[PDB]
Write a protein that binds this ligand. Structure first.
Ligand SMILES: [Mn+2]
Ligand SMILES: [Mn+2]
Ligand SMILES: [Mn+2]
Ligand SMILES: [Mn+2]
Ligand SMILES: [Mn+2]
Ligand SMILES: [Mn+2]
Ligand SMILES: [Mn+2]
Ligand SMILES: [Mn+2]
Ligand SMILES: [Mn+2]
Ligand SMILES: [Mn+2]
Ligand SMILES: [Mn+2]
Ligand SMILES: [Mn+2]
Lengths: 285, 284, 283, 284, 283, 285
């Protein structure tokens, strides 16, 4: 109570709660993204004092019952156990009617989530903010750059209605994934880019995943794999806000590595983005 | 002598000096006390330029600026800081001097507004910040309440005031014109300045600049950060675009050196401060 | 596997199958610039094709890193002389130079060696400063582009200075594209004007990292607010492909003032782009 | 559940729990608010040890410890923090629980002393700090005045109290025995502990630990640092040497994470905290 | 001039006039340990005779640095196998090893190679942890000195563990000199007991940097308060001269958590002492 | 006024003031010791609130008129001008009857000071706290490791009554300088070491110079040339305090490089040592 993200209530038995949205922390890397959820929670008090978060004219916590269920408990080193307890957690939540905002953690945390969400929402469109496309063909079982190769192959997402925003590194130009790379995103208007995004997604249900490395290192230095020429936090937030009218079933923010943060501005970016992900959900009501 | 901000002369008895502009540091409340120190130390970066770019003249040739050090007051006592600070300002103003002031908590502006209102009348406030600082029901010494109190005491006129760079909850119905960061970041400097001049009119202006207006990327060293702010480039051009307004006093506040990174925030504040001085000099 | 971008170290590069040689020049807190740049560059090494390129620079050029220049602990005079000798023998053997600072001063020896082998050059200069101070000490950064034209090394009248944010001289023949306008103009616009100024002349490309705004390059000794973004820096560099760049360096990185290695990463990324735009013209 | 300090259970309704010891965080005033957060985050470093060295048993097997989170109070209001904090403590104490408390400003101890005095009588204070915190003429909410006020309100008896690690000006004439850092650093642990036991007697003890007691080399993360302090090794052995005293409550305060370096200070505090728990457990 | 302590790099060290070879083993935030250690070591290089010694180690041993071990980005199994192969071929050619971590796990391959060439060894272990966990993952730091005795690589009964500050097993044959007593006893006292435990057996010297108190070595991934000072660490290492040390490593340095480079400097200084005490016995 | 070190009065015209002791800052390196005096001043407020600085039972500022004259103004790059304006400054102060506590800055700052002091006090005994002996035979004209070679050769100090405390690096064992190296200093009692110091110095006038690198890097990380195995701040302060009965004519603290400081603990060590240097002067009265 008054102890989680944004001073929301902790509830460690959330499956039968009245919550609409459950926040879950997943401290996991396989560096230093393990403390991402702690850092995000700790800095979110910056945001909590606004009754109506700018620029909105209503309070999210009045339109949505959001609870923080803490962090996922699993064997210290084991990633298989992480992955299985994460998908299990996610399935039990979805079956109870709840929706998920999730804090990472390694981006790999997303595969368990997509798997669980796919069972309840069908094949999904992926809106992916990152500097990496994370479609690596031959990597380790738990590599965090291989999950959006594995997800289409397991029929979890449809590349042909997915969009990858802020890319700045080598990628495969023929996946059916539409790559809106940081170069053009930075040189195009937010409206322009949202228009193109909406055209691709359709009315398909969306999973929204945001690796913080998508922001330029100056705006978000606290990440393990930085790439220069990224987005501003102002552009990120405007883009996220522009996704209001999509059918976003679930969402997560990942790769925040507090050990490389500077005066918390990377955790602040994640907490503000996570809150915007909530407000756009509340604004559809 | 050669020891204060920008290697300007220290003068701890400025009231009868032949200085036009007096720099005053006010170390007051986290940890924005070293704001003035940080600003002065980093300012030597700028001092070597004879004509600070992009100006084609030397501010120091057109204006006598002296740095009078920091305001002495009972260490924790805030009611002393205010009375000592207003008195300082009143005596400087009566002697014909003008003030560039370094914070320090943003609250320090309210004493300076009281002092300035007695000498210049009701003012227009040009307010760069991420917060509107109009909180109605707060502690008498809360930093985010100065622009609720000031209109109520008749110091400033909301209806010619403007609040630039806002990124947090505010009050749309109170007379202040709020140019939010979302907007300012998407609009040209000329567009915004035009609008600023429209609202302000011919009226006299007190310019207050809370560094949290700048995005934490450029001003990480602040106590209450908000993402999606202004760049240093935009902040400096906007400030430079107020040349033609009647700016009677000015301050830069909320630099918390504990959270600064490679002295970036203090550099921005000192640069902005210097630009505030050139605006004055380019009219003389 | 051990030098910049996991390239081969070759401490005997004068006779070698390499077409380009990377040389660290630790010199003054920019001693450690070259180390910082190498260490962070592994972030880029894993990309077969460095985005947004369509091929691997490593398959179009043999590039080797011969380490750092050895000179007397404090003697800058030996530093200069051993630096210019180093280049003269590299440039002599039909090998090019990407060099890492280090003090910006390091460019002046390199310009002396380059002028003997390519003639008077156009200077493409990324910096917040113009570095043209006449009445300055013998070994001093800032003064090089007063000395270099008087020694007939570069032609101011085809030289361009990009990102300037500080006091400078308007009447000396250098074209200054200050950070105020560079940030308000399109890259294409600026590149067009660069190409117009330089013409067909061989260019030396020098990049003082303070050109970037301190938010992006905090790790610098002489920082100035209101500079360029890394995005704009990289697009401008990339836009110089069609010019004839004979030599290039990246200087002023100071790790003691770096934050989460972002200055070093910006310099390593720019340096890699300087290599790609070379590889772009040979293939 | 598995979420609080040392991965212990959270329980936000601890008053009727079957817990022996309750951990409470009090975020209050620079920037010692994140003291509790910092302590909890770093504490996982210790949690993996089943028998925390050098003990030959597991504290968690002998004691039910729960973490009840942080004290909620009106954000800036300090008079609320005190009344809410004393009430919290009184209700826990009446229910038979004992308190390990994380600061937070050192001032938080005075409410906890009021609560404890009602349940345990007048106490002996064992006080590790670089400051004596006995300032007579201060603000009602000044951190360095709690051990002037507490004797005057009859909460503690100076004549069985001891102040360990002092490195700054103090008052020799007020009943407290002051073991200065110069002395403690030159004397064996057994020597000092002998003396501590002599002074304290059989009387009940409240153990308060301000982290600035540790030399800034080991606890850089503090707001008022003083050189020539204690090592973490000496601090932990001294604390461990109080096993036989009747310690009724305990706290660790003044961890300012903004000034911490690689989480060293928070680690020391959490380790010391855990040792405070083992002292209790080794008597049960 | 480019490796540790400005020693020569030699990427082909198997046939070389060197008697000792320095090898970085970047492995997991200890990837960057070896770099950090090399970069800071120049602080020591300028001393002809490293204090308090009466001669130059560099004039009694040929020491070279062959860089870092090349292995698959994430495959630790290849890391181990290429590491043990590396050592087996070095130890085979009559060359010794000072190695830099890197994860402490790196020692286990090195112990496998060393045991084949020197037999079962006494372990002199500086760490806050005993690293004897039985029921742990295949590749995991902490478990090595459970695996190493079961594989007959070391003899617990002549092995000593110095600086322990955490849970451990009292009954397994290892002699634990915990940081509580080590800090309360004289170096001579402790060295005497070390010499008594080890006897005439060949020793492998492994130094996990968390042994030092976090105040002295902040840059570590698993820190524990109440550890050793660098002064005491260096005096203890120095006191092992008369023992027969066949191989040595320094591990767990994590720069992401270092403060003003003091952890790296402590490790580079210890490593240099490990070299002097070798040079002490040959001259 | 109330603006210098320890909130003491600034006085930029100190030669004819009533001060006994003048504090002078010398921002100079030839890295990053230039801001040493600023850092020292800024952190000294930590100390200023104690009326009687522990462990003393009197107030220094009651027994001594101490003023801070600011920093020495000279040509930005030129060290010759630094050196000459520094010695000139020092001579004018000494001739006026004033005594000097000086903040560095590069250790080289000491040569101008010794030169000026020698003219007024004669040949001096040097009490030197540092990890380096600074007796380098062949270095640059302004090398900061060569000044205590140059000073005996110019007849400024007598090595045979000088003592070098906390040494941890290669030095020349036959200078007549008595080296009390950190190894033994750390293993010997403070009384023991002071006794030996007093025996060597005699009643000769002492210049006390303290390079902060003498402290172990953990206690004082903010220096350019660190060496491990140094002294604690507690031992440094006790030793300095033990020099009360020597005839210390002048004093300085040098090499504080704020760019490598951690939470100001290096500047705090210098400011506390500098204050102790003042209290021992006041305690003889
Ligand atoms: Mn990414
Ligand atoms: Mn990703
Ligand atoms: Mn604000
Ligand atoms: Mn404000
Ligand atoms: Mn520059
Ligand atoms: Mn330059
Ligand atoms: Mn205290
Ligand atoms: Mn206290
Ligand atoms: Mn360990
Ligand atoms: Mn270990
Ligand atoms: Mn030294
Ligand atoms: Mn020295």
């Amino acid at each position: 109570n008054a102890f989680g993200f944004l001073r929301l209530p902790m509830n460690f038995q959330p499956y039968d709660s009245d919550a609409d949205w459950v926040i879950t922390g997943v401290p996991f890397d396989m560096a230093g993204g393990r403390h991402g959820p702690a850092a995000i929670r700790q800095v979110s008090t910056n945001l909590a004092w606004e009754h109506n978060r700018f620029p909105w004219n209503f309070d999210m916590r009045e339109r949505l019952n959001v609870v923080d269920c803490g962090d996922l408990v699993y064997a210290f080193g084991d990633a298989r156990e992480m992955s299985e307890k994460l998908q299990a957690h996610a399935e039990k939540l979805l079956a109870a009617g709840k929706r998920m905002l999730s804090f990472g953690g390694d981006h790999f945390v997303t595969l368990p989530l997509l798997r669980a969400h796919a069972k309840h929402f069908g094949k999904m469109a992926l809106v992916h903010f990152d500097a990496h496309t994370d479609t690596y063909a031959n990597g380790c079982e738990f590599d965090h750059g291989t999950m959006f190769y594995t997800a289409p192959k397991e029929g979890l997402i449809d590349p042909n209605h997915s969009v990858q925003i802020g890319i700045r590194t080598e990628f495969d130009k023929d996946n059916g994934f539409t790559v809106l790379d940081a170069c053009q995103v930075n040189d195009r208007s937010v409206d322009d880019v949202i228009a193109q995004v909406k055209q691709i997604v359709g009315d398909m249900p969306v999973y929204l995943t945001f690796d913080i490395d998508c922001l330029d290192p100056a705006f978000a230095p606290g990440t393990g794999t930085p790439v220069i020429g990224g987005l501003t936090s102002d552009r990120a937030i405007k883009l996220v806000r522009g996704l209001k009218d999509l059918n976003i079933v679930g969402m997560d923010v990942v790769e925040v590595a507090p050990a490389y943060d500077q005066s918390e501005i990377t955790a602040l970016a994640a907490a503000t983005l996570a809150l915007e992900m909530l407000y756009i959900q509340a604004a559809k009501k």
